[PDB]
Amino acid sequence: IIGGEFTTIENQPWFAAIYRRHRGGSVTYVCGGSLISPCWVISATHCFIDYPKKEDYIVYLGRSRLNSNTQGEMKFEVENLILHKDYSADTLAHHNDIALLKIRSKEGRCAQPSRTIQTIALPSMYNDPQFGTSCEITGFGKEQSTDYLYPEQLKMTVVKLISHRECQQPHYYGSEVTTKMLCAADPQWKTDSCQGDSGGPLVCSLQGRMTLTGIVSWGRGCALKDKPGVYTRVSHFLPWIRSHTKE
């Protein structure tokens, strides 16, 4: 997250931290995700596509820090890693960038709700906030495009939704953006998602309910003029989510 503010998991308790074990034993952060039911985390396919084997991954819930344990956190294996079959990569503009991780502890159990671990509601089909609406994004991604390190403490920021009409302009993204994607940015371009925020939640309040409106997917650079963040539009994948969460 470029700009924005440090936070703790109490403020985004559906946030899932996803890591990969390397042969040799090294573990590294991969991507964010969102808990949508006790056994299911939703994320982005591009985070996993190069390394699709479920045994490589570890998922934490209730975690506020990247490389330190948070009191009350829970650690899970990935029982199933489901990637979208119509995923594609075109320069950077990923189509159908959505994935499901079925989680299971060493004890064989799913998530247990607490102050630090909660689910996020999904939107109704084709029901998104009006453009110009403010939404939140959360992650452990870079704080500056030039940074090497990820922040050790979770961050969040606010961005505003941008219409497809505006995003499809040539000086924004042209044909790279589809109606299955949502763009969002800051009016001053001073805050944005960045590398390592992929798979994380874009949350908007719709009819008095906090709703998973989008999933961090791609963008050209970060916090650059005329180059918004691009998010998978969750309200266009409800049938896909519903079928695959019975696997």
Partner: peptide, 12 residues
């Protein structure tokens, strides 16, 4: 490779 879309990729 320094931005969103290429996390956990074999090239990067």
């Amino acid at each position: 490779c320094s931005a969103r879309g290429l996390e956990n990729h074999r090239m990067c």
